[PDB]
């Protein structure tokens, strides 16, 4: 994978929560592979 800064992840997570239910499934699949070995992302998303 590629590394993202914290602010990069934030901006991405922002988009997920604004998405509707059906779209969240599309985005979460995307983010799931893209942040495989980032334990920070899950935490970062769940908080906000």
UniProtKB/TrEMBL annotation:
Q: Which superkingdom is the protein from?
A: Eukaryota
Which residues does UniProt call coiled coil? none
- Name recorded for this polypeptide: N-acetyltransferase domain-containing protein
UniProt source species: Trypanosoma brucei brucei (strain 927/4 GUTat10.1)
């Amino acid at each position: 994978t590629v590394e993202f800064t914290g602010e990069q992840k934030d901006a991405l997570i922002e988009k997920y929560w604004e998405a509707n239910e059906a779209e969240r499934k599309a985005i979460a699949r995307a983010y799931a592979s893209l942040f495989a070995n980032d334990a920070d992302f899950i935490q970062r998303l769940l908080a906000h």
